[PDB]
Amino acid sequence: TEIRVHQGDLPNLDNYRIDAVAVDTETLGLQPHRDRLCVVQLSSGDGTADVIQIAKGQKSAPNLVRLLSDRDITKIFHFGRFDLAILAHTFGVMPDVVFCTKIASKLTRTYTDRHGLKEICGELLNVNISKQQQSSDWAAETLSRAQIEYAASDVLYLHRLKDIFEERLKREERESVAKACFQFLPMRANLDLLGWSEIDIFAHS
Amino acid sequence: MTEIRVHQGDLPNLDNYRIDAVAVDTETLGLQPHRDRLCVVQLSSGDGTADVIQIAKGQKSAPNLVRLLSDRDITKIFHFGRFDLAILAHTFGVMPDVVFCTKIASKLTRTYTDRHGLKEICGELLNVNISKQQQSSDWAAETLSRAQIEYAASDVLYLHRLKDIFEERLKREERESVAKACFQFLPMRANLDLLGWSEIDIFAHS
Amino acid sequence: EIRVHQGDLPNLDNYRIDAVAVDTETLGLQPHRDRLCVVQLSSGDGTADVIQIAKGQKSAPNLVRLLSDRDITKIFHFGRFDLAILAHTFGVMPDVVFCTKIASKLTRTYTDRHGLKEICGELLNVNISKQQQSSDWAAETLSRAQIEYAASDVLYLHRLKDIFEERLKREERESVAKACFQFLPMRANLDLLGWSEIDIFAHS
Amino acid sequence: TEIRVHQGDLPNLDNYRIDAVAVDTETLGLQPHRDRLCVVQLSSGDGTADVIQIAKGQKSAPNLVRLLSDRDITKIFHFGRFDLAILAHTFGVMPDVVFCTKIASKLTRTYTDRHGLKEICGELLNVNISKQQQSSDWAAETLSRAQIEYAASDVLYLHRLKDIFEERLKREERESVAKACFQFLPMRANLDLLGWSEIDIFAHS
Amino acid sequence: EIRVHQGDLPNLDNYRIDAVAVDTETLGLQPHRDRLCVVQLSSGDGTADVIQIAKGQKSAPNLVRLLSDRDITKIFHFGRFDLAILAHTFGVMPDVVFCTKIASKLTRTYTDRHGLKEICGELLNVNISKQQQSSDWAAETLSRAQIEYAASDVLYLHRLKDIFEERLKREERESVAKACFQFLPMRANLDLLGWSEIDIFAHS
Amino acid sequence: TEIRVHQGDLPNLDNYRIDAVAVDTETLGLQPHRDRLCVVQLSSGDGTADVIQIAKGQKSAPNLVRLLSDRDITKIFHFGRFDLAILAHTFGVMPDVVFCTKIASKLTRTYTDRHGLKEICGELLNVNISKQQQSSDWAAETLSRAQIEYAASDVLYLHRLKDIFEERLKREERESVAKACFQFLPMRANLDLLGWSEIDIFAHS
Amino acid sequence: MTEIRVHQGDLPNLDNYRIDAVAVDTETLGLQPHRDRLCVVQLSSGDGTADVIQIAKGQKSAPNLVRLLSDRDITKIFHFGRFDLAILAHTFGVMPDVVFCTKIASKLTRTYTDRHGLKEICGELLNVNISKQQQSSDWAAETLSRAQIEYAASDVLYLHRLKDIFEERLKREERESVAKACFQFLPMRANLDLLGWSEIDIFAHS
Amino acid sequence: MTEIRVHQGDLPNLDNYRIDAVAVDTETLGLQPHRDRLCVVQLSSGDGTADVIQIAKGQKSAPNLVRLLSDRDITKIFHFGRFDLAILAHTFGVMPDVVFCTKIASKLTRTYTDRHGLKEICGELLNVNISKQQQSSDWAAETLSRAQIEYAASDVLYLHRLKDIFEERLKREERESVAKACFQFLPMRANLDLLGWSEIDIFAHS
């Protein structure tokens, strides 16, 4: 599996002249105001991935941010609620053309309450995600090989997952539902950054 | 005393509703729209009067009411519009797409409390006392009691005033775009409820 | 008025009727530990019979005839309990029953409060005072407060049943309610047999 | 051994001139108004099973429904509360002669709180049920062999379980209790469909 | 009338009796942290003695005589606590006790409310006011409200014990209650030794 | 491992001319008024055991009851609260000379909250209790070899556990505490039968 | 009758605070300092008078108030200083480091209760009734109501008296050094909150 | 292959502990210091060897150990020193005041996890397997088993290495002063436990 490791940014957009890009991040934790962005992962869906180490205090990443702001390119996430928050917090740009495989799973895999990436990859693709490195020092100057393979695996399969979920959403006639959820997702991420992360804004109480 | 006009089935006309925004509430036989039928629709133009419309069992249309609901030039003001939107679309087939919800607005602005119900908000923002005693009553009754009628009217008589104050706070705290986005999703949150996700926060990790 | 009896009704002169309201008072909620102390009856006419049951009493032929008579519907509020302590004490389980709590749950769909006090207040504007519910129901002489409270448990069940029957018809749930009432005695039996903490129909 | 797979309906009832039939279903989830019926499984208890795929929007299946309506044939379920709801919701017919092994288990296996099909088959028959395919896309146009074999395993043993539970119900003198529970079960399923699925209708509060 | 003492009773002239009502006040529920502040006594005659216990006070010989006197039953409400703090402070564990809280749990089977205020209200129509329960019981001079409150904890235990004895006999639970009172000093010891959060008889 | 299996009662007391006997029971469940006594197990501590099947409706077991009544013989249980209740409920005699290894564990193994028999046997004796048959039909006319061996394991080690616990109670100076707990245990079992099984009679609330 | 001096932005001078200890409290738009701005700072010298300082949105300095908060010769008295210290440090950039907290003091002396709120403490120790009606109010309002102003003043008018009593109790129970150590750590506990550990007991095993 | 020196009562001398920091753990009869006596004290210099000291019932002194514990020129490294500081001070009358706690350090650096136990941290940072089987055993045994001895030694063999990594991370994330204030309060937090606040977060609002 070809995994290209970069410092700071993509060197160019040559591998991403595409309509959709799979995106994930690694951080020091779940709290974007405390836990810095450490890694950004990308794949075009061709079976290879880019792993971008983000430095402490890094304010800019122009090639990555070009993709994030390109409205001709759908940003595919698994649980984009988190990735959108830390990406917009770090580089100042919120994507507004997105697809989330966790939301799509909640709308289509109605026979389960297990919507994690590992569960979804195994059921839909018979692909085994190993989570051992999720709890690791993502701020390390040199990521280990196990870390780099794990980070790549978070984006290697999102295109294939999106294709299946799009088929399920059509079959169950839920495309307009999903579209509305993906349209609000960036604001749900902004709500988290502004201080409503523990609040379901739509709940009665 | 408040002028309350009680109607059977529909408004007789829209002469009182050539306006920019209308306050709306419903009463039902309970919280489950597939089991508990729409019983009452309440409306107010914001002038201190209200219309109380009794909806019959099995009633499939309400042309004048549905006209307002579909009018993109009229903002429908709800308190917890998530519920009213679901039952209204379920009963008459039309989902409003221009809304303001004082419950969402409260959660975005009254950040110093966890109490976001209508009674609490009217008391704090307007010194108005809402009595909830009739909230649990037979809303399907053929003749509503005066207490039911006055309580149903009270749910819509203050929403314009609440919306004015919440708009001031949204602007003061720079949250107008957040609120607009939430209102834009609210009809789809209501449809999610009707489709079978009423117990699921669709944006949660688990 | 309220007629107080020891042991049994003297006769059935006041119960040549098609439906009778029934409630019980006990020393607590556990029939195998907490004996039956009182049985209250009403014909619906605004009078009640309050029957004190002795410790160790195993028979009351006039009361039990009513409980056994399939031509008389026994009206309860939460008959699940009364059916159990009555069957446990006298050995007979009534099988023609109406329960206002089940009726409430099937019709007052806008609330989770289905107790007798809430129901009497909402449907009849009648105030039930629960202060004597926690009292020594086994006292040889009941206080006037206990007697009037015990009577109030049965004075309004005919009127509640009439309104609930109207609502069950309106919402087209009559056959559902009938099936629930039909199972209620077996639900009471399940309680006496050891399943009182188990919803027998739940997945877990 | 033999699993016969059908589309739409049984071709006939040649294999079901019997006095009791084992029945299970598969759906897109637990919510009958949202999650459509996808598969109906049947067994005569002879070690063979019929697995019938149900199409989206299909509201009839005359051979199956004749069995379900036949008052001379007991329908054996495990947790019939669910199957009765989705069958009645889909086909318009509510079976009224039933046996449920889950209810039987709660009335006889008084030394445990584990009343699932897997646990009962292990204990009473030394038969292993694998539940890996319980969470799968039962709406698939073509089921996998693992799905088909799992679905069959839900009905292959219900006759044998019913025979043991009947022995136990007799031994502990609970036959009338079980019969009354089975008699109310179709109405408990109806209550679920009408909106009381989260309410123990017999509870005090 | 309430007699307020410093340190100890002056004599036992009021306590040549078969049973004495006892309660305590402390700085809190933890005996190893929260010192004994007050000890209250009543002979049952409608008067009380309120004894302020000083910080570091190691003895109270007249009080300890009553506590050690095998011919005098010590009546407590929730003796489990009083026995612990008394034994920890003065070194003596009473072994002849009656506890109205245990007695209530064994007889008032129609409720889960077994506090002293609830029991006095139901059995005696006596109103206990708990306002001073949270107050500085180590104060050098207790307020009148504190004093009256501390006395109210012992003024009615004789009358309660009499009713509870009647109920225990009626329901045939005397030997059960006696066994519970027999173990209560060791339950208190278990608390002092480090098991205050453990039901020693529970399966888990 | 020698296990003698009896119907109804011991044939005689020749193996139990001893100062202490280990006792356990098997039933159809945890509820003595619903779940009948099925098995009584006994051991003298010599590495052998007696397994006594109790018939439905059996009201008498004179040899077993002579031991339960013999004040010169300590009855050793693990969690005797249960065995005392079902034994007194079934045959009418409450033992009053008892040692409980669970209570002893709670008073000595202060470094853990795991006081089950399997945990204690592993830690104190390096003996492996297998609980697979705990959930089984103990009313069966013919018990399986696995059932009989498991039932025997419940009594084969209680003497050795008692000796160790007695040493620890002495070392930590808690002998009089344990003695009072054992003295009250028959009444705790009685309280259970009378209707307080869910109530800690000594709790503030 | 209680004299309350209301200021915009800052104290005009320190003439009323040439003292050894100052009572301090704050009002905000809520409990989350990164979202909910500092709206009011209240001060009292213990003399029965109070100063109520309205803080503007985006205000970053208040040099006279901040001098008080930085002056190591002046103990700042708080009730639940954990919160005030965090919002004050977040807003003005200075963390006070000589503090007394009546809530910590209460937890170490009122061992017979789990109710350690200011209302509860004032009633028991002083027979003073604190009314909490305005706690949930719009503290960012341009003009505070008389009710809000009197409530804000009441948070500081009694803290000197509470501190005296708690100091007596801490000496009596021989816990002065414990309290001192808790106070010394309190600014770091507040800093931990601002840094992202507000929901974590940093000293707990799990 | 691991040199573990076992002693009764005390170290025989301090020849192996002329060092700047010593790793310490304890074993007891349980988590309650007033009921559950000190049974073992373990030490390591960080050199791959350990000392395991059995403490007798009722023993109140251990002069060589206590000299180390009192030496302000030597940092005592603990994992969850809150517990060890309590039982050591309770048993020997001396409260160490120069300390490092790897559990607190983990909570301040391993921000991506709620698993801060010694086994999880050893596995993650060092790829070292801690086997907890003997944690539930009779530590008051007159003769400890080889398994008990090896387990006890494993609690202290790696704390120097953990300390060095956590120090790197505290520097990197700029939290050194935070950690230092936490370590500074930790002896008083242990004292609070001994005095009766072991179930109370003294800094919490409620």
Author numbering:
A (entry chain E), D (entry chain A), F (entry chain G): 2 to 206
B (entry chain M), G (entry chain I), H (entry chain C): 1 to 206
C (entry chain K), E (entry chain O): 3 to 206
What does the paper say about this structure?
Orn and NrnC are 3′–5′ exonucleases with a DnaQ fold containing the catalytic DEDD motif, a domain that is common in enzymes that act on nucleic acids. Notably, Orn (and its eukaryotic ortholog REXO2) or NrnC activity is critical for cellular growth, rendering them unique amongst the exoribonucleases known to date. Through quantitative structure-function analyses, we show here that NrnC-type RNases share this narrow substrate length preference with Orn. The structures confirm an octameric assembly as a conserved feature of NrnC-type RNases.
Similar binding poses to pGG at NrnC were observed with pAA and pGC, suggesting that most if not all diribonucleotides can be accommodated by NrnC.
